[PDB]
Symmetry: none
Subunit: 65 residues, 10 copies
């Protein structure tokens, strides 16, 4: 259809514990800046800065393993 | 927390029948364009151009009544 | 999702879908070349339909209100 | 089906995907307004990629003959 | 969601909450002047807590995992 | 009242609210990084507004006096 | 906004009958001493010493039940 | 009885419009710092710094006139 | 209020107050030399009473629960 | 009344009142644990003042003979 798109205008400042995270997605390229959104065990959603080591590590891990 | 913000880059082109709509909200000023998001009875979410009048009409009705 | 593809209809069904086959529907994006209802069945079959048809709209109404 | 929706890309990804995320590709229908490669990740995600881009071309080539 | 206000803690509770008073939590936006955990009580109250305390991170884990 | 979180606005609505959407307001704590007026709508929503705008101070007066 | 904070400098000396109490709250950590404030059926407000046990008892009961 | 006492730990930063204010009181001397609390037309309550000109002016005025 | 005086009882009434005279009651501050119920009548008469008396406590209960 | 509550001061004001706020005074009962002057403002507010303080003494004197 024509749903709204998820964008991030601010990033969490805290590294999340690995086992708090159960999934991720990357925000559209239409958004004004790049971002990763992590889904948690309690199903919360968290904007996270893709420039940071820990974010990439979790992304690599959720994708590959 | 630091969750995603809903943003509309593309708007629906049809006019929604009034009775398909149960709720609405308006996208953050941080988005690159103004938008109204309508919620339908099937719990779907549709971007809508706030410059269209039926959009304004339904918004006043949902707010006031 | 990120930058996934959009669903678009380039033809409309010519045969009416049995109403009880259909469990859901969506409208295709306005980015598409033409408007279209996509009907969804229980076995997850996807059927493009002409929005200007009367049974299409009748189905859409039943799905949305009932 | 008899008249299924077609996958089309209108917006591309601005990111170069990690090659090791990508396990497959496919090209969008000629019926689409524009040509696109859609990459498919290990996780079954779908990423529209702009065929004009060199990484996109290189990725396809590598998938095909490797 | 439009432009509603953000929850920020400028002070932390100095008392420790009995674990069975708590039923949920969240952390404050990075936009705030300091980090904080906000617990939600059975009676539906909201309590700013210092994230550097042991009980605070214990509760958060327990809430998040179990 | 114990140690609940403080409401702070980090961004202001860019739209002007129809006067008859609004039914109450408050101003944010001086503890916040910037000043702000938060309006409460008929549908009970909360909207951060820029205190330096004309309509914002008009509404506030009207709400406060009449 | 920027309203006053409730603080207890003197505590009540009697034990409130349970059924006089309808609600409670706990004074901000900014105050100079810990306190529980009980609300009565006549909507009065009574500081109470959190170190006293009937105080704790009633608090658990109001929260849990 | 033994009610809680109103204390202020932070002061408004905005000078209130005179006709928003309908009353004042001064906070107990038991509180950790001196303060004035203004009551408004809508019956809100506002901690205000007594060191400031505008506060004293309103205090003088509500007292004398 | 600011630093207003406290109400304290230094004697207790020796005559029982007609129950229907009484519309409200309060307990005197613990800062006082002795405990006391202060009963309030319709014409705003203030009457100190011994908390250990049975009619005093009976009145207090009726006022608080009914 | 037959046994009315007595006004007593346990805490004093740390502020020197503006002389022009004060329209009257009275002294608390000898039954009180401590001696106090209670000032009465234009607005009928009541302020316990510490008789040890010079401004308090001066205020009383001025009220009495002026």
């Amino acid at each position: 259809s024509d749903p709204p798109t998820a964008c991030c205008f601010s990033y969490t400042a805290r590294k999340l514990p690995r086992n708090f995270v159960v999934d991720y997605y990357e925000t559209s390229s239409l958004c004004s800046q790049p971002a990763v959104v992590f889904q948690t065990k309690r199903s919360k959603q968290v904007c996270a800065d893709p420039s940071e080591s820990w974010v990439q590590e979790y992304v690599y891990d959720l994708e590959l393993n």
